[PDB]
C-alpha cells in the first residue's frame, strides 16, 4: 500500500498527542505559577518535567514526523533531529530521580529538609541536569554516529545530493549507543535507582508508623502496670520507662502537652522513690487526662502527616512507573534489533506504535496530578472555569 496512507495515520496520531501534551503541561506550569500552595521544591522538578513534555509536543514530535519521511539531509543535521528527543527523555529521568530523592529526604530527615532542600539549590540542580541532558542526548553528535558510513545506495535512490543521507533514525544513530549507553546506562540504571529510593521511602514510612503505634501502646501498657503494681519499685520501673519514651517522642499545644506529660511523670516518680505507692499511682492516673487531651491529638496528626507522605510518594512513583511503561517497549525493540541480528526487524507498524506510546508519556502526568493531588485538581478547575 502507498506509504503515505500508513504515514498519514502515524502523523495524525502524533499531532493529536502533541496537542494534548502541550495543553496539559502548560496547565501544570500555569497552576504552579498561580498557586502559592504549589510553589515548593518538589514542584519545581514537576515544572521541569512539564517543560520537557511541552517540548516533546513542540519539537520532538515534529522532529519524529520529519525523520519518518527519510528526507534528504546533511547527516549531522539529521542526527540533531534524531537525538533531540533523547535530551528531553534524559531531562525527564533526572527530574523523576530528583522528585524521588526529595521525597526521601522529606520522610527520612524532615527536621533538616527545609534547610537542606531550598528553591535556589533546586533551580541550580535543574540547570545542571538540563546541561547534562544535552550532553548525554547529543553524544552521537560528538562522533558516536553512523555519518562516517552513509548508506549511499539509499541516498542515490532518493536523489539526495552530495554529502546527504536519507534521514532515518536507525541509519544515523548507532544501536550500540541506543542500547548500552542510552538504555542500560542512562535509563535503566536511573530507573532502578528510583525503584530503590521508593522502596526506602515506603519502608521508612512503614517503620515510622509502626513506631508511633508502639509508643502509644507502650504508654498505655505501662499505665496498666502502674495501676496493678503492688510496690513502689514496680511503679518506679514503669515510670522510668515512660519518661524515656516521652522525651523520645518530644524530639505549642503539643509542647505544652509533652511538658505536662513529663512533669506528671516526674511528680509520680518522686512519690514512687519515696515509697508512696498509692500516692504515686494516683499521680500516674493524672496522665490519662494529658494523654486524652494532648498526646492522642499529636499521634493522630503525626499519623495523618505520614499517611499524606505515603500518598504523595505513591503519586510520584506512579509517574515514574508510567514513564517506564511508555518507554520500555521502544527500548526493548532496540534490544531485539541490536542483540538478535538473526531475528527479522520489528515491523514498521510496531515501530510506529512504540514511538507513539513513548510520546503518550508526555500526555499522562497532568492527569495523574488531577486525579491524585487535590491542590492541583482544584487549581486546574479554577483555571478552566475562569
Ligand atoms: C528555538 C527553536 C524553536 C529552534 C528550532 C530550530 C530547528 C527546527 C532547526 C535547528 C537545526 C536545524 C537542522 C540543521 C541542519 C539540517 C540539515 C539540512 O540538510 C536539512 C535540515 C536540517 C535537518 C535542519 C532542520 C531544522 C533544524 C532542526
Ligand atoms: C510491560 C511492557 C514494558 C512489555 C512490552 C514488551 C514488548 C515490547 C515485546 C514483547 C514481545 C516482543 C516481540 C517478540 C518477537 C519479535 C520478533 C522479532 O523478529 C523482532 C522483535 C519482536 C517483534 C519483539 C518486539 C518486542 C516485543 C513486542
Ligand atoms: C524491565 C527491566 C528489568 C529491563 C528490561 C529487560 C530487558 C533489558 C530484557 C527483557 C527481555 C530481553 C530480550 C529477550 C530476548 C532476546 C532475544 C535474544 O536473541 C537476544 C537478547 C534479547 C533481545 C533480550 C535482550 C534483553 C531484554 C530486552
Ligand atoms: C527513543 C528514541 N527513538 C528510537 O529509539 C527510535 C525512533 N525511531 C526509531 C525507528 C524508526 C524506524 C525504523 C525502521 C523504519 O523503516 C524500516 C522506519 O521508517 C520510518 C522507522 N527508533 C529505533 N525514535 C523516533 C524518532 C525515537 O525517538
Ligand atoms: C557526557 C556526560 C559527562 C559529563 C561530565 C562533566 C562533569 C560535570 C560536572 C558536574 C557539575 C556538578 C556541580 C558543578 C557546579 C558547582 C556547584 C557550586 O558552585 O556550588
Ligand atoms: C500544524 C498541523 C498540520 C501538520 C500537517 C501535516 C504535516 C506534514 C507531514 C509531512 C509530509 C509527509 C509525507 C510522507 O510522510 O510521505
Ligand atoms: C488531527 C491532526 C490533523 C492532521 C491532518 C494531516 C494529515 C497528515 C498528512 O496527510 O500527511
Ligand atoms: C519552553 C518550555 C516551556 C515552558 C518552560 C517553563 C514554563 C513554566 C515555568 C514557570 C512555572 C512556575 O515556576 O510555576
Ligand atoms: C531548550 C531546553 C531547555 C529548557 C529548560 C526548561 C526549564 C523550565 C523551568 C524548569 C525550572 C522550574 C523551577 C523554577 O523555575 O524554579
Ligand atoms: C502542535 C504540533 C505542531 C506541529 C507544527 C509543524 C507541523 C508539521 C510537522 C513537521 C513537518 C515535517 C515536514 C516533513 C519533512 C519534509 C518531507 C520531505 O521532504 O520528504
Ligand atoms: C518551532 C517549530 C518546530 C519546527 C517544526 C518543524 C521541524 C522539523 C523541520 C523539518 C525540516 C526538514 C525539511 C525538509 C528539507 O529540509 O528539505
Ligand atoms: C538551548 C538549546 C540549544 C543547545 C543545543 C546545541 C547543539 C549544538 C550541537 C553541536 C553539533 C555541531 C554540528 C556538527 C557538524 O557541524 O558537523
Ligand atoms: C539550537 C540548534 C542546534 C543546531 C545544531 C546544528 C546542526 C548542524 C547541522 C550540520 O552541520 O549538518
Ligand atoms: C555541568 C554543570 C554546568 C553548568 C552549571 C550551571 C549552574 C550551576 C550553579 C550551581 C547550582 C547549584 O546551586 O547547585
Ligand atoms: C548544548 C549544551 C548547553 C545547553 C544549554 C542549557 C539548556 C538550558 C539550561 C538551563 C535550563 C533552565 C534551568 C532553570 C533554572
Ligand atoms: C552500566 C550500563 C551498561 C553496561 C553494559 C556494557 C556491555 C559491554 C559491551 C560489550 C560488547 O560491546 O561486546
Ligand atoms: C540487564 C541485562 C540485559 C540483557 C543482557 C544482554 C543480552 C545479550 C544478548 C547477547 C546475544 C548475542 O550476543 O548473541
Ligand atoms: C549488563 C550488561 C549486558 C552485557 C552486554 C551483552 C553481552 C555481549 O554481547 O557482549
Ligand atoms: C518488561 C520485561 C520484558 C518483557 C518481555 C520482553 C520480551 C519477551 C519476548 C521474548 C520472546 C523473544 C522471541 C524471539 C523471536 C525470534 O526468535 O524471532
Ligand atoms: C497491541 C499490539 C502489540 C503487538 C505485539 C505483538 C508482536 C508482533 C510481532 C509481529 C511479527 C514480528 C516479526 O517477526 O518481525
Ligand atoms: C493513541 C494510540 C493509537 C494507535 C497508534 C498507532 C499509530 C501508528 C500505527 C499504525 C500506523 C502505520 C502502520 C503502518 O506502518 O502501516
Ligand atoms: Na517526559
From Swiss-Prot:
Bilayer disposition of the protein: Multi-pass membrane protein
Parts of the chain that traverse the membrane: 9-33, 44-67, 79-101, 122-144, 175-199, 316-339, 348-371
Alphabetized UniProt keyword annotations: Cell membrane, Disulfide bond, G-protein coupled receptor, Glycoprotein, Membrane, Receptor, Transducer, Transmembrane, Transmembrane helix, Ubl conjugation
Positions in the Cytoplasmic compartment: 34-43, 102-121, 200-315
Family of this protein: Belongs to the G-protein coupled receptor 1 family.
Role summary: Receptor for adenosine. The activity of this receptor is mediated by G proteins which activate adenylyl cyclase.
Annotated adenosine binding sites: 170, 334, 358-359
Biological-process GO terms, alphabetical: adenylate cyclase-activating G protein-coupled receptor signaling pathway; adenylate cyclase-modulating G protein-coupled receptor signaling pathway; apoptotic process; apoptotic signaling pathway; astrocyte activation; blood circulation; blood coagulation; cell-cell signaling
Record-given protein name: Adenosine receptor A2a
Reported modifications of this chain: Ubiquitinated. Deubiquitinated by USP4; leading to stabilization and expression at the cell surface.
Superkingdom to which the source organism belongs: Eukaryota
Subcellular location: Cell membrane
GO cellular component, as recorded: asymmetric synapse; axolemma; dendrite; glutamatergic synapse; intermediate filament; membrane; neuronal cell body; plasma membrane
Broad class of where this protein is predominantly found: membrane
GO molecular function: alpha-actinin binding; calmodulin binding; enzyme binding; G protein-coupled adenosine receptor activity; identical protein binding; lipid binding; protein-containing complex binding; type 5 metabotropic glutamate receptor binding
Amino acid at each position: 500500500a502507498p506509504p503515505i496512507m500508513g504515514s498519514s495515520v502515524y502523523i495524525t496520531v502524533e499531532l493529536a498527542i502533541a496537542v494534548l501534551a502541550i495543553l496539559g503541561n502548560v496547565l501544570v506550569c500555569w497552576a504552579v505559577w498561580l498557586n502559592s500552595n504549589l510553589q515548593n521544591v518538589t514542584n519545581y522538578f514537576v515544572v521541569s518535567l512539564a517543560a520537557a513534555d511541552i517540548l516533546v509536543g513542540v519539537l520532538a514530535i515534529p522532529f519524529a514526523i520529519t525523520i519518518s519521511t527519510g528526507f534528504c539531509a546533511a547527516c549531522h543535521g539529521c542526527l540533531f533531529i534524531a537525538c533531540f528527543v533523547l535530551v528531553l527523555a534524559q531531562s525527564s529521568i533526572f527530574s523523576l530521580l530528583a522528585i524521588a530523592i526529595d521525597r526521601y529526604i522529606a520522610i527520612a530527615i524532615p527536621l533538616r529538609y527545609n534547610g537542606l532542600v531550598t528553591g535556589t539549590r533546586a533551580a541550580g540542580i535543574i540547570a545542571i541536569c538540563w546541561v547534562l541532558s544535552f550532553a548525554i542526548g547529543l553524544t552521537p553528535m560528538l562522533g558516536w554516529n553512523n555519518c562516517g558510513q552513509p548508506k549511499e545506495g539509499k541516498a542515490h535512490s532518493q536523489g539526495c545530493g552530495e554529502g546527504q543521507v536519507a534521514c532515518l533514525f536507525e541509519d544515523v544513530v548507532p544501536m550500540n549507543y541506543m542500547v548500552y549507553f542510552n538504555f542500560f546506562a542512562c535509563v535503566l540504571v536511573p530507573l532502578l535507582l528510583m525503584l530503590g529510593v521508593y522502596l526506602r521511602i515506603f519502608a521508612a514510612a512503614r517503620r515510622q508508623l509502626a513506631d508511633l503505634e508502639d509508643n502509644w501502646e507502650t504508654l498505655n501498657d505501662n499505665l496498666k502496670v502502674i495501676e496493678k503494681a503492688d510496690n513502689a519499685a514496680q511503679v518506679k520501673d514503669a515510670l522510668t520507662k515512660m519518661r524515656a519514651a516521652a522525651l523520645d517522642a518530644q524530639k505549642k499545644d503539643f509542647r505544652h502537652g509533652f511538658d505536662i506529660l513529663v512533669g506528671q511523670i516526674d511528680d509520680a516518680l518522686k512519690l514512687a522513690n519515696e515509697g508512696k505507692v498509692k500516692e504515686a499511682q494516683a499521680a500516674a492516673e493524672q496522665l490519662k487526662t494529658t494523654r486524652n487531651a494532648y498526646i492522642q491529638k499529636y499521634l493522630e496528626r503525626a499519623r495523618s502527616t505520614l499517611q499524606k507522605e505515603v500518598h504523595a510518594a505513591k503519586s510520584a512513583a506512579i509517574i515514574a512507573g508510567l514513564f517506564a511503561l511508555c518507554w520500555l517497549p521502544l527500548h526493548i525493540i532496540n534490544c531485539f534489533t541490536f542483540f538478535c541480528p538473526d531475528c527479522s526487524h520489528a515491523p514498521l507498524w510496531l515501530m510506529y506504535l512504540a514511538i507513539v506510546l513513548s510520546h503518550t508519556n508526555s500526555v499522562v502526568n497532568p492527569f495523574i496530578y488531577a486525579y491524585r493531588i487535590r491542590e492541583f485538581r482544584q487549581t486546574f478547575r479554577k483555571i478552566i472555569r475562569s
